[PDB]
Amino acid sequence: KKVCNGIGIGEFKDSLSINATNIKHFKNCTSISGDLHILPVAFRGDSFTHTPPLDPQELDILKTVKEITGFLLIQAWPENRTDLHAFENLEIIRGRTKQHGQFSLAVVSLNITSLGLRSLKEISDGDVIISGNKNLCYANTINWKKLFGTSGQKTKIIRNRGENSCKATGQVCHALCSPEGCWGPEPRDCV
Amino acid sequence: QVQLQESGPGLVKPSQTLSLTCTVSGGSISSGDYYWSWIRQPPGKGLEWIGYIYYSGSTDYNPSLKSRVTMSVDTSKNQFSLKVNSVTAADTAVYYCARVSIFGVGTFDYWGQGTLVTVSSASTKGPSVFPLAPTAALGCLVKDYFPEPVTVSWNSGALTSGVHTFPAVLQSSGLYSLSSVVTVPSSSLGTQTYICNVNHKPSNTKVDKKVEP
Amino acid sequence: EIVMTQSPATLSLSPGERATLSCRASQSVSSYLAWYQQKPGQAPRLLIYDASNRATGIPARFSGSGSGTDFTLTISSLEPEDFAVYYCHQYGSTPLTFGGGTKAEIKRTVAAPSVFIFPPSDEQLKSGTASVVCLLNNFYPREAKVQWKVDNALQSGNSQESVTEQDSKDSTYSLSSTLTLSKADYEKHKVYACEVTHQGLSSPVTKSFNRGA
Ligand SMILES: *[C@@H]1O[C@H](CO)[C@@H](O[C@@H]2O[C@H](CO)[C@@H](O[C@@H]3O[C@H](CO)[C@@H](O)[C@H](O)[C@@H]3O)[C@H](O)[C@H]2NC(C)=O)[C@H](O)[C@H]1NC(C)=O
Ligand SMILES: *[C@@H]1O[C@H](CO)[C@@H](O[C@@H]2O[C@H](CO)[C@@H](O)[C@H](O)[C@H]2NC(C)=O)[C@H](O)[C@H]1NC(C)=O
Ligand SMILES: *[C@@H]1O[C@H](CO)[C@@H](O)[C@H](O)[C@H]1NC(C)=O
Ligand SMILES: *[C@@H]1O[C@H](CO)[C@@H](O)[C@H](O)[C@H]1NC(C)=O
C-alpha cells in the first residue's frame, strides 16, 4: 500500500492536471489523498508550463490506484481507447472533496463506449455526472444507489448515447449478467 | 457579465456554405464547465438543435443535418463558429448560439440575440408600389422586392390609428410581396389625402404614393 | 430521436386565469426536461429545469411537474407579460429536441371581420399581371375561411394569405388574401368574388366587383 498526493495538493499544488511531467510520481500509488484531474492540456501539452504532451500509454500507471479520497474528473481521454482502462482497479471514491462542491465523479464528452470501472464498489459522497459521451452505452444499467453511501446522492446521466440506440446495435449486458447491471459488454465486465 | 452575440452574412445562395461566429464576453470559452451550442428557428416554426462543441475539441451534431455541419473554436478571440454547407431554403432560420452549464442547471441558460439567414438565389430588387383604392378601407401593395427588410408609413407617420401592415409573403418567383391597409372615415375621402411611404434600404428606394378613388 | 409533443398548440386564456401546458415524450426522459419562454423577436428564456426547479429570476407563478414521459408547466395566474410561446426541451438524450411550441393568446369576445375587396390598378395591368386583394379586418377568433370565385369558378393554388399578430389594443386578427393572375386570364372573366366564412358572421359574407366598373 502506498499513499500519494492528488492534483492541486502538495508537490502538485499548482498542477492543473495529471500530465507528462507529474504522472511518473504516481507510480505504484494505491491510494490518492486528494483529487484527480485529467484535462485536455494533459494530451496537448502546455508551453507556458514547459509540459510535454502525455503519452496515452503512461495512463497505465494509474492501474494500481484502488482508492481516491477526493473526486475524479475526466474531461479528456484518448479516442483510440474504448473505456477507462487505467481505473480498472479503482474500488472506492470517498468524495471528501468535490468538484464545484457537489460532484465526486465526472466524465465529460469522451469517445469511450463503456466506462470499464469493474472494481468500483462504493462512492461515499458526492453526485455522479456522465455528460456528452455520444458513444457510451451500459451507463443506466448499473444501480448507482447501491454504490452510494450518503443520503442526497444522485446521478446525472445526460446527453449520452440514447438507451434505444444502444439496444439496436447489441451493446447490452451479457447473458450471464444479473439485473445488477454491467460495466461493459464482456462477462468479466459484469457486476 | 455573460453575453453571447452572433455575426455573419444574412444572405446565402443555395448549394453554397453558411458561416456564423459567436463572440463570447464575460467569460472564457475554454473551460470544462461549459458546452457551446447552436440552435436555429425557421421563421414561424420550432427550435432545432444543431450541435455543441467542447473545449477538448469534442463535438456533437444533429443527425438531421446529414453531416453538413462543422463547428470550431478560436480561443484567441473567444469565439466559436458554425459552418453549414449545401444549404437550401430549409436552412432559412434565425440562428442562435447558447451556452450550457454542465455542472449547473444542465441546459441552455444564456442565449444570443439571434441572426436571420436567408437561403435564396434571388437578386436584390426594388419594390413596386400599387394603390389599393376604396368607414372605408384603403392601402398600397408593395410587390416584387428582395431582400425581406421593408418599412411602410402613412402620411409621414401621422396616422397610426387603424393601420395594419401584413407580414410579407414569399412568391414562387423568389420575391417578396407585402400589403398595408388602413381604415378611415368615408366622409374624409373627398377631402383628406392619404400617402403611404415605402422604404426599401437594400435597393435604396424612396416611394411616396398617394391613394384615392 | 426523442420526439417532444406539446398539446394543444394554442391556448386562449384571459389575464388572471390558471394556465396548464402539457408535454409528452416518445421515450422516457427521466427528469431531464426544461421549459422555455419566447416572446416575438427575442430568444428563449429558461423557466424550469429538472422538470420542477425554477431558474433564477423566474416568478413563483411558474412551476413544473412530471417525470418520465408526461410533464406539465403550470402558470398560477397569467400576467399581461406571460402571453408568448412556451417550449419544452429534453437534455437527457442526444440528439437534443424541443417541443413544437404552445402559444398563449389573449381570449376576447367574438368579433366578425370587416371584408373589403380591391380590384387591380390600371397601372399594374400595364405590366402584364393582376393582383386582387381581399382584406378581413379586426376579427376574432383567428380561424377564417377565404375562397376566391372567378365567374363562379372556385380558385385553387393561385392565392396567398397573410395574417397579422394579435393586436395590442383590441386583441383582434386581420387577414389579407391576394389572388394573382396574368393580364390574359384576368381579362377572360367578369365577376371576381371573395367569400369569407367566420363564426362571428350569421352567414358567409361575399364581396365582389365586375371587371371594368
Ligand atoms: C504539469 O505537471 C507539472 C508537475 O506537477 C507542473 O509543474 C509545476 O508547475 C507549477 C506552476 O507553474 C510550479 O510551481 C511554481 O513555480 C514557480 C517557479 O518557482 C513559482 O514562481 C510559482 O509561484 C509556483 O510555485 C512547479 O514548480 C512545477 N513543478 C514541476 C516539477 O515542474 C505543471 O504546472 C503541470 N502543467 C499542467 C498544464 O497541468
Ligand atoms: C470514437 O469511438 C468509435 C466507437 O468505438 C470509434 O469508431 C470505431 O473505430 C474503429 C477503428 O478501429 C472501427 O473499427 C469501428 O468500426 C468504429 N465503430 C463505429 C461504430 O464507427 C471511433 O474511431 C472513435 N473515434 C476516434 C477518433 O478514434
Ligand atoms: C514500484 O515497484 C517497483 C517494483 O515493481 C519498485 O522497483 C519501485 O521502487 C517501486 N516504486 C516506484 C516509485 O516505482
Ligand atoms: C492511439 O492513437 C494514437 C494516435 O495518435 C496512436 O499513435 C496509437 O498507436 C493508438 N493506440 C492504439 C490504437 O492502441
Give a verbal description of the structure.
The complex is a heterotrimer of chains A (191), B (213) and C (213). Chain A is 8% helix and 18% strand. Chain A contains three helices and eleven strands, in the order E-E-E-H-E-E-E-E-E-E-H-E-E-H. In chain A, strand 9, helix 2 and strand 10 form a beta-alpha-beta unit. Chain A starts with a strand and ends in a 22-residue tail after the last helix. Chain B has 213 residues and is mainly beta. Chain B has two domains: 121 residues, no CATH class; 90 residues, Sandwich (Immunoglobulin-like). In chain B, 0% of the residues lie in helices and 51% in strands. Chain B has no helices and 19 strands. With 213 residues, chain C is mainly beta. Helix content of chain C is 4%, strand content 49%. Chain C has two helices and 20 strands. In chain C, a hairpin with a 7-residue loop joins strand 19 and strand 20. The longest helix of chain C has 5 residues. The radius of gyration of chain C is 23 Å and the shape is elongated. Chains in contact: A-B, A-C, B-C. At the A-C interface, strand 11 of A face strand 10 of C. Strand 11 of chain A pairs parallel with strand 10 of chain C, so a sheet runs across the interface. A molecule of 3 linked components (NAG-NAG-BMA) binds next to loops of chain A. The PDB classes it as transferase/immune system.
Short overview:
Chain B is mostly beta strands. Chain B contains no helices and 19 strands. Chain C has 2 domains: 1-108, Immunoglobulin-like, CATH 2.60.40; 109-211, Immunoglobulins (Immunoglobulin-like, Sandwich), CATH 2.60.40.
